[PDB]
């Protein structure tokens, strides 16, 4: 299915040894997993997930 981030428009590279599984889904960062609680987007400075 191609390892993809739970975010609707996010597809950053996810690493198994640090995979953030939240509610059974994988995310690229702890930010996407928690729907960006600290208001912090993901490490990708060009990504627009949750922004748009
Ligand atoms: Cd993103
Ligand atoms: Cd990302
Ligand atoms: Cd993400
Ligand atoms: Cd996100």
Swiss-Prot record:
This is Metallothionein. Changing residue 48 to N: No effect on metal ion binding capacity. Zn(2+) 1 binds at residues 10, 42, 47, 49. It comes from Pseudomonas fluorescens (strain Q2-87). Cd(2+) 4 binds at residues 5, 10, 28, 32. The chain holds residues 2 to 53 of 82 of the full protein. Zn(2+) 2 binds at residues 7, 32, 36, 49. Keywords: Cadmium, Metal-binding, Metal-thiolate cluster, Zinc. The gene is MT. Belongs to the metallothionein superfamily.
């Amino acid at each position: 299915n191609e390892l993809r981030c739970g975010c609707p428009d996010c597809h950053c590279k996810v690493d198994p040894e640090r995979v953030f599984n939240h509610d059974g889904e994988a995310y690229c960062s702890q930010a996407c997993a928690e729907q960006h609680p600290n208001g912090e987007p993901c490490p990708a400075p060009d990504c627009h997930c949750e922004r748009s």
